[PDB]
Design a protein around this ligand. Sequence first.
Ligand SMILES: [Ca+2]
Lengths: 13, 355, 14
Amino acid sequence: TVFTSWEEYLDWV
Amino acid sequence: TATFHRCAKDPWRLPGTYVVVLKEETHLSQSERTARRLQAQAARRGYLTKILHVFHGLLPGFLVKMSGDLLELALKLPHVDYIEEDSSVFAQGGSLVEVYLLDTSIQSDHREIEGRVMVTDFENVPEEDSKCDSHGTHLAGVVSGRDAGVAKGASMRSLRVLNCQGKGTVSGTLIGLEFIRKSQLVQPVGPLVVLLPLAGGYSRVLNAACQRLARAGVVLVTAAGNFRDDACLYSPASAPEVITVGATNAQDQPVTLGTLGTNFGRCVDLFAPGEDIIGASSDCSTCFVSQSGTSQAAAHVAGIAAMMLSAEPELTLAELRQRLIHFSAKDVINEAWFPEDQRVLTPNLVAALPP
Amino acid sequence: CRLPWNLQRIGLPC
Ligand SMILES: [Ca+2]
């Protein structure tokens, strides 16, 4: 999975 | 007497191209005269030879594209130590320290590593048989990235030795390591941490070069390999004066990558996080992706060694290795994942920064 | 303090 922003990764994990 | 060597892993062999290694104290003029002697003796026997490159800095030698029929004769030349047939290699704080990355092309405009990385004009990749920059960008991200980076304050210099398919050559890496040495002699800087997130089969020449560069005061960090095998059968991993890094997961268990996984043995120095490593994705300028392998593991150690050397620049290579070991989490990895006889030989150490 | 497991494990402060 590729996250377009750092914040996107944080909501996921 | 001179000896001939070729990669034991047959698919990885690259015939027709040879690295002629000469005796330690051979001068550039002597090496050039030897390549011309070889070219003249071959032409006299009706053979077509091309001198691709002449080595000087680390090892006295030259690269030659020629028939194998000439090896017995090439072994008879003066100053010759050994001749190695070219083989393939595959992809697997910190302010006053420069990190050299020998890898694929990198996406330097990425908002994570923008400004931190200097893309050198160096390129030496074999022909292929976003995704092309993928491997290098992530490792540059792990080493110095703005959000997910280990040594955020560290600056990087990138060299291209791996193609879009993540493939390189022994000679390509040899020319690369020689370029670092020349750059250092032309404009000296401070402590250097060279990251090699690549591996091929055991190579006499690649190890010899890694030993000279190490003896020259340069720190060399490498991947153990993703072959679930003894790391002593792979180069540069088998080079003793190098920091060989294996990968472990979140559950202090060695990383499994399909049917394979991290390497082990008496050649591995320590281990570091290698499963689910978040870093820079070359897809877009702000993009992030999770990658795995002994490359990501080595990238953590490259970050730790940068921070450690920035804080204590006078440290000798032997002293730094003691610091890496002393600060590592001890007896945490599940030994039972490795083959029975490798357990006593494999060091149960997971890389960590001082508290 | 939302630090990735790897950065947490190697002992980086968040
Ligand atoms: Ca070692």
